[PDB]
Ligand SMILES: *[C@@H]1O[C@H](CO)[C@@H](O)[C@H](O)[C@H]1NC(C)=O
Ligand SMILES: *[C@@H]1O[C@H](CO)[C@@H](O)[C@H](O)[C@H]1NC(C)=O
């Protein structure tokens with residue numbers, strides 16, 4: 001996954017995308033997560049060496065686009 | 068409630084939520100109201116007789 005924002009310390013808004021092998025969780029909640037950042041307020045929420053994955057993230061006009 | 072103090076002009080459709088007491092300049096405040104330390108959150112007190 002990826003986590004976005006400006007300060008990321010439960011003060012202002014922070015994006016979160018996590019793939020948990022069944023769905024794609026997208027949250028904008030500011031709250032903290034697992035203390036070690038690894039895999040074992042919500043105004044917007046969206047639930048859906050052999051491999052090379054390419055992504056492009058950009059942010060224009062308040063819009064987050066993912067290619 | 069409405070704003071009168073901010074340190075920057077917001078980009079279109081932006082959602083930075085911050086209701087702390089803001090400085091009026093370079094003087095630090097540390098969350099203490101006073102001179103050059105003003106709250107942005109004001110009200111208009113909507114009455115039907117205005
Ligand atoms: C993945 O996250 C979604 C959203 O909370 C949840 O419904 C689902 O059960 C999760 N799957 C696993 C395997 O943790
Ligand atoms: C979550 O929402 C409550 C209600 O406004 C707020 O008091 C709290 O600070 C929020 N949590 C954050 C911003 O981490």
Ligand SMILES: *[C@@H]1O[C@H](CO)[C@@H](O)[C@H](O)[C@H]1NC(C)=O
Nearest residue numbers: 006007075076077078081083
């Ligand atoms: C976005 O956040 C940064 C924090 O590093 C800040 O400096 C910048 O002014 C912010 N942009 C705004 C409020 O448009």
